[PDB]
Amino acid sequence: KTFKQRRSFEQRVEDVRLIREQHPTKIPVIIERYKGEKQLPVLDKTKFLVPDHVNMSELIKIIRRRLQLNANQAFFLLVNGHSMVSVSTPISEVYESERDEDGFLYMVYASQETF
């Protein structure tokens, strides 16, 4: 069961509302593994709050360090079910253009560029 299946729409919108009362500039990001990925490990946690000014290469480098991936392993992020943005892009601009109708920014990761 994915995050969207676990929590209802009403509950997810409330989550986002609550968390941005506390942290008005931080980005609520849902990070999950792509259903078909076997090589990369599932992340310990799903819900992340990330600062506005962090860019995508910084975000991927964080997650790589959390997962202790060795240097030769590939790591790709697919956003909102379709978007592979430039890694130079701050996560705040991604949230502006790619956030879900519930207020979360959904991503999935994999080690293959196809999805």
């Binding site: 946690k45 819900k47 992340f48 709050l49 990330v50 962090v54 910084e58 964080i62």
Partner: peptide, 16 residues
């Protein structure tokens, strides 16, 4: 068993 995971500055710095 709390869902919200914030990245510390320590963690963010170490990325760069």
């Amino acid at each position: 068993e709390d869902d919200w995971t914030e990245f510390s500055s320590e963690e963010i710095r170490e990325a760069r």
